Symmetry: C2
């Protein structure tokens, strides 16, 4: 029916083995974080390693690659079948762009590099990690050559984490944020409307109190708990898809600052819904699943910030908070909303509010570009970081852990990854104004917990296409236009001005 | 030091891949029963199926079997290395004894027969499963021929589930039970020093109360919770080995008859300890792990019955029962002992006490042997089944559900499996008498919760050797004698007369 070409079918049967191995990995990883007694790590680690090598092997097997090149040349394929070919053609090209010994080198350098990152952080001493960063930079440039770019070295790595993304796209979006968000940010600070801190940040809670709250929210979102999804606790919130009918999320309960576990939970719901709403006809195939990190982030941010931080959502949840949190007797829905919408320039990215958040990513983009496209030395980075930080947020890191040693990303050799976060942020606001024209009383829906029509809109515009189309093609198909940072600027204004 | 020969090294390097899939399969299996949202079943299923086809493909991969064959020719291997050859050789032989087309047929009939068995049992109508039973009887005989045997066709199937076991051995242990255990049973029954029932069977409890008791006990045994083991809930209690350093067990809380959840937990702990105490130098190798179902059963029965139902255990447990179970206010520790040692002839095997238990297995042994040996029609089994019941236990099933339609085993095609349960039961008593002359104050240690020396003895004698030696050679090594049913008879006599 959907897949009827004889070659496409042969490709799909061979792919089921690859898919299967992926299902095992997802469970292995999920379990690692959620149930695995600590000493099970070693054996768990070797099993994952072995599986990773196996799947790569299968992906590059001459029979599988050849079948794909053959289908690539067929003229009678339907759009779904063409999706399969497109997706695999790209995975195969990336999977074989790096030589086997280069992959070996990157694996070895990064492992030591991260061990050195942890050392440098524990000693608030950058010199420990410095020499290893220079070796990562060098590898990042070799990597760019391997994938090959066609404009600028940094394009190759940007494309690696967000298919089709070019340095121009990122440059332009941030160019817009510097001319409009920045002054917008400075006015909100002096303005006053929203605070830089809130006492609710300090209120304590017992685990049980907040998990009831989280469970309440998910139920109202219509999360298929026990049926097609689960909620668990782990060290770091994430989402994992075992299948279209088995998507799991996790959150953590710090024991204070309850906004954290909520928005974190809603954030993951955003990702999970994308996977839950995949076209079941695509089950077991390469076109089922979110297309990119950028698009996935647009979904998590849509739910977390476009909805999770709105007054209607706050109003919708308020009675539940009051019902489970004793200290809530002293706070009104206005308190909570202000608490949910704190704007405050600070050092830690993961701590950043939605208005200052992107500038953190903007700084990483700037440095990363210079590192891969130019010839900078690791020793000069920490100071560049602090200058950009002061220039954008008006604060200068006083400790390495407050600046360049925040994230391990560069230590994992993950260069060109960061801008995907801003992509999610901007796209969230952009989708906001688009769903708004099909659902003008969007806010009323949130207040009344009538999320079905919102979820089905996301489903028909984004989720259902899985990976049939690359990110840019997918976005134009959903809203008829390219990504544009202007929408985010409007959202912040409308939000705080 | 353990693995030195080049060929064995090559065999092990390749086996890690196979080992890795088993690790994955174990996680998928465990998760399916413990956490998986019900609708995840379809995708988990094809994932498991694809993996089994994979592991089976690697076990018979040309370059692998070849190496195993070469290793089999060598003459200077040490016991550990010879063990790797023996185990792998057995697997490979069984893996290719059946033609791919005979596996389909077997798989087709099986599910079809299991489905019919399902309804036939629900409706107490044997005629619906009868024809399927005849077909299975035919597959069993055909399996036998493919596998080979020297004495009787049944040896082939018996050896299929327990390396080295032969009809002659099973018949020998059952003759002892028929001639000595039988009159002991009748004497125990006619005397009634132990009841056929106890009010503690109807007392209700809430899961929280019993999970505490279960944990307290496991803690007392020194169960490495959070470190190298876990305890969770599932439909049927079971033990799963992810790795030497990650062994998990499950139990169920019926909600009443608290003896069930306790003995179930200890039962699985018996299996867990065995795996937990494997020689870490064998990690990732075919020689790590319990050698056979039968030996594994001896370990669960050892803790469950030898320790679990002893009076020393009841005394140790008594105070924990008094504090977590309000209804215990009306019972003395004797009551608990009596409750734990109920003896009564019943129709259902899974509910049989330790004395009448082996008789349920004995009758299945008799019918299975005649089935695979002579020309029996499925239509004659029900009545043969009931006569045995009446002969051995003095009761006769009234409905098909209370008789031959009891378990799925035959529907699934598991012929030659049942006797392993008896081996486990007999072996546990044999080890009991042996551990007592090394640890004369064995009982006193149970009462005081000093299990380390007991576990250490178990480690030195059985666990440590993994699959290095076949079941029988292993026992000869550890106990200096062969499987002898006389010990169980003695144990029952010592316990109840």
């Amino acid at each position: 029916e959907v897949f009827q070409n004889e070659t496409i079918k042969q490709i799909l049967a061979k792919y089921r083995r690859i898919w299967a191995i992926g299902h095992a990995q997802s469970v292995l990883g999920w379990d690692l974080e959620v149930n695995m007694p600590k000493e099970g790590i070693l054996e768990r680690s070797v099993a994952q390693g072995e599986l990773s090598v196996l799947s790569h092997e299968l992906l590059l097997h001459p029979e599988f690659v050849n079948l794909v090149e053959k289908a690539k040349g067929l003229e009678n394929l339907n759009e779904y079948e063409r999706g399969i070919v497109r997706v695999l053609d790209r995975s195969i090209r990336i999977a074989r762009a790096f030589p086997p010994e280069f992959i070996r080198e990157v694996s070895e350098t990064t492992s030591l590099a991260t061990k050195a990152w942890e050392e440098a952080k524990a000693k608030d001493d950058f010199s420990k990690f410095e020499p290893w960063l220079d070796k990562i930079i060098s590898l990042a440039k070799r990597a760019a050559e391997y994938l090959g770019y066609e404009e600028e070295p940094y394009d190759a790595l940007l494309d690696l984490y967000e298919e089709g993304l070019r340095t121009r796209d990122v440059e332009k979006m941030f160019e817009v944020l510097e001319k409009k968000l920045k002054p917008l940010l400075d006015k909100i600070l002096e303005e006053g409307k929203v605070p830089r801190e809130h006492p609710l940040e300090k209120e304590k809670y017992e685990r049980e109190w907040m998990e009831r709250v989280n469970l309440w929210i998910l139920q109202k979102f219509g999360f298929p708990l026990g049926t097609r999804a689960r909620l668990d606790v782990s060290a770091h919130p994430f989402t994992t898809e075992f299948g279209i009918r088995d998507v799991r999320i996790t959150t953590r309960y710090e024991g204070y600052d309850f906004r954290r576990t909520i928005l974190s939970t809603v954030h993951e719901f955003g990702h999970a819904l994308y996977e839950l709403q995949q076209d079941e006809r695509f089950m077991f195939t390469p076109i089922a699943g979110g297309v990119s990190l950028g698009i996935h982030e647009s979904q998590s941010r849509f739910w977390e910030n476009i909805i999770g931080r709105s007054k209607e959502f706050v109003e919708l949840i308020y009675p539940v908070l009051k019902e489970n949190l004793p200290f809530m007797s002293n706070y009104t829905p206005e308190d909570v909303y202000l608490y949910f919408n704190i704007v405050r320039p600070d050092f830690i990215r993961t701590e950043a509010d939605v208005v200052t958040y992107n500038f953190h990513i903007l700084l990483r983009f700037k440095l990363e570009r210079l590192m891969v496209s130019e010839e900078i030395k690791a020793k000069d980075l920490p100071e560049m970081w602090n200058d950009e930080m002061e220039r954008l947020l008006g604060i200068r890191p006083r400790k390495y852990s407050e600046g360049i040693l925040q994230d391990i990303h560069w230590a994992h050799g993950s260069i060109g990854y960061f801008p995907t976060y801003t992509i999610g942020t901007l796209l969230s606001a952009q989708l906001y104004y688009h769903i708004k024209k099909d659902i003008p009383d969007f806010e009323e829906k949130v207040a009344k917990a009538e999320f079905d029509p919102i979820k089905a809109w996301l489903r028909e515009k984004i989720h259902r296409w899985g990976s049939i189309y690359p990110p840019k093609e997918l976005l134009k198909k959903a809203i008829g236009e390219d990504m544009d940072a202007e929408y985010f600027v409007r959202w912040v204004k409308e939000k705080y001005l």
